[PDB]
Automatic annotation (TrEMBL), chain B:
Domain of life assignment: Bacteria
Residues of the whole record sequence present: 51 to 198 of 1039
Organism of origin: Campylobacter jejuni
Protein family: Belongs to the resistance-nodulation-cell division (RND) (TC 2.A.6) family.
Localization per record: Cell inner membrane
Gene name per UniProt: cmeB
Protein name in UniProt: CmeB
Amino acid sequence: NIILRVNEDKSFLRIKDVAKVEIGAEQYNSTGRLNTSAAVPIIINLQSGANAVNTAKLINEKMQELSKNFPQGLKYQIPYDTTIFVKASIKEVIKTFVEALALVLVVMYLFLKNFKSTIIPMIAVPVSLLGTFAVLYVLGFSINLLTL
Amino acid sequence: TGADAQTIASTVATPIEDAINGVDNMIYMDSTSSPGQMKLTVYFNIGTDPDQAAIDVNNRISAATAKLPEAVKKLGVTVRKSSSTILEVVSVYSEDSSMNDIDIYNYVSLNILDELKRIPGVGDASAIGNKNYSMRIWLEPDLLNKFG
Amino acid sequence: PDQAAIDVNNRISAATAKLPEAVKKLGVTVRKSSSTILEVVSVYSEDSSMNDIDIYNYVSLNILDELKRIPGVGDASAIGNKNYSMRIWLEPDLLNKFGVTANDVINAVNDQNAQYATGKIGEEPVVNKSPQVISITMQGRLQTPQEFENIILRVNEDKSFLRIKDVAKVEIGAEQYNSTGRLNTSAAVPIIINLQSG
Amino acid sequence: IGFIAYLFKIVPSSLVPSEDQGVIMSIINLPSGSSIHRTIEEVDTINKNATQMKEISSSVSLIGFDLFTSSLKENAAAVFFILKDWSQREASSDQIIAQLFGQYAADRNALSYFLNLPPIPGLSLTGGFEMYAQNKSGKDYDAIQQDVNKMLELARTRKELANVRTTLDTSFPQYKLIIDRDKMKYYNLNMQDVFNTISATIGTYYVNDFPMLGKNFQVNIRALGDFRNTQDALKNIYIRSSDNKMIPLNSFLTLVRSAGPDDVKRFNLFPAALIQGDPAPGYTSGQAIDAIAEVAKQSLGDEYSIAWSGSAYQEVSSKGAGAYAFVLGMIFVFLILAAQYERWLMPLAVITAVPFAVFGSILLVALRGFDNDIYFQTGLLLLIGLSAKNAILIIE
Amino acid sequence: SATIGTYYVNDFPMLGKNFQVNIRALGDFRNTQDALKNIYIRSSDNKMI
Amino acid sequence: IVLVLCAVFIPVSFISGFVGEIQRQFALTLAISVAISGFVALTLTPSLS
């Protein structure tokens, strides 16, 4: 109903006459798809010097909270995330740690016949590892697969 | 709004590039100009704090603002600490297909994107496309000429 | 020093709006002058073939940027302050003769010598769905003295155009002629280099 | 010791080995002219063909979006394929990439490159190296285009390089509008009014914001669909002169076709292109980087200077630091052994055990086919320590 | 400012960098104290003053 | 043994870079672990035995 000209007949000329008005996107160039279905993919850039896993847990929780409030017929999927790879690698490294510790136990028992002789160095191992973690905390060095 | 990439590069990137040149601990610098936008990425040594890097970049651009031709369009100028890594990608997809891409994008931007920006450890959360609601006015040249 | 510079910049950013139009157009620069000179490379023309303006612009275009590249060079700057500029020299007698004032010349130069935006043909909101999208390019800028001389101030009742060439003389010259740098007899431009901190 | 030197010479180098992250990213680049709907069709077909493969679980696409520069290009498209969990699937990522390449070799229209995610996410987004051909003495980007075309051909001639491609592209179609200033002023038309009409009718004119759902949203003005298309727009548009007479824009504006680059890149104050190549299977990142450097030095003129970025820059800058650290550690080990032992000579015997550990490590790695890398150097350092420890047990 | 002084109208491109465009009266006219006489302005009624 | 292991690891700390950080992580971790293990072997292990 915006008026452009009086028209000197007291009949206003309005934008409806010369144009069609409709609410639409600013740009229609780009579209996103998840499988065949259409979707809007939002990319989350990790802040410089921030923990990836903790942020992901925070995001997933917040997105669940929002999912509780989603409009009817809306779902969220996180197809790609870097936290899954980190978790899998950390779990694999933990399994490798356990395997190495078991192998060291076997070698130690084989070489030193007595059980006590085997446990004594084996109980020396945890104190050293734990102290390493403690100094890592003092020095502010983040835990990486490199550290493990 | 609109322009050619060659002119934007030669006139805008070079005066800014020299201004940035000499910043503390910059491994390399690159600039890319596209129709309607210019992006200038500056990189720094691993030990350099990105916060102080941004401060020094702001200082240099302020000092060299004399040799700057970005004056034609001052609506948007941004200097942002950027992160190459993307923690994850979340696709918001509607099951019923009742809402089209524009509506989903607008709802996401209104509700979820802001809350994600707030979440700690998130440097940035953005959605592909710029399909925000906008009051598109479609002029009809035939009627526009008819009515004078 | 960086903290002082950034707060000063932030304050002048808010204060910029209050300033007159010309200051805002030129802009307000914030810098740190704590560092001292490391050397003053003076570039002179021994044979005087190239005047001060050419020496100053060559140094700014080709020399200064190279020196900025050298590691440890905090800053590099010439002292001439005489960059190129399409100086238009008005002649008041001719302006009076042709009935054109300086304001008309300013308006004509501002209006004609200006690059504005353009759209792209065949964008997505189309019924046709054309095979390819072609971006419209429209420069609308003048870059040669001959082009500037052809700016049309006014069209006479007879279909002959009045142009700046009739009421002025257009040439490329320094933005300011207030200063001059001379090493011995030969003209020169002094390049001052401030060492990078640390 | 001689055998150690020879083995070190023959062992390939690379900063970090290729890791299977379980995600395959595909970059689909339709010809420059083609608009978005063509990319939607091609990306849908790519997903349909890829999702048939069992190992690939789901695919998330970014149509119309340039992944590496984040630019919004109509032709560009980015597709991520999410694989099954590592335990579930039997075929590694590289084999799936090869199968996909074999499948889509037939598609002439669309160029698709299937790349694994970089092992180190931070350094770069593209798994392959990034090389820039800086032109110091260049004048125009068409020269850059044909020079990089020659360079890319010679790069694909080598075996150490695969999937070599350049971002720069000057084949985009463009329209150049020529303003007849004389005629326009003869029509008593202000230049800026004409350009405002051109911007509004052809492009989007942002006038001001309006309130909706709280936030302010833009108001945009544009012509309606077909009128922009077909290069006949100028005849329909009219601009009023100062005499209030309608003037068709076709009178004093002529539209002439042309071709010019869409995206323009500058690096370290030099116009340059981005050459990104994926090291060929069987050859490491270091070999590919050396090969592409040699090809750039040969094919491209002396004006072109090569600069590195991301992982390639990290490797090229950090080469030799491992060796320097190794020798410094050896000398400090000598000093501390001399201090503790109180005899100058014996630290020499203690050190002489290290070459055995180094020989073992390099020999076994060469036999297994593994390549030299940062992890290899760390292992060498720790084994330097372990061999020293064995030596201390005996010499004390 | 346009005749006696320098008026910075807009930029023009040269050697890739943007350079100013400045309008000033010819130096011979503006040097004297009586420079104002030779300058004229339009009175908004199509008359020179 | 602990001295030889930490001495070889110390020079890693000074070198800085992309390789520098990677090598330094190992240097620090192994060095502290061996230091604590050596203290344990010196003091706790004989007492327990």
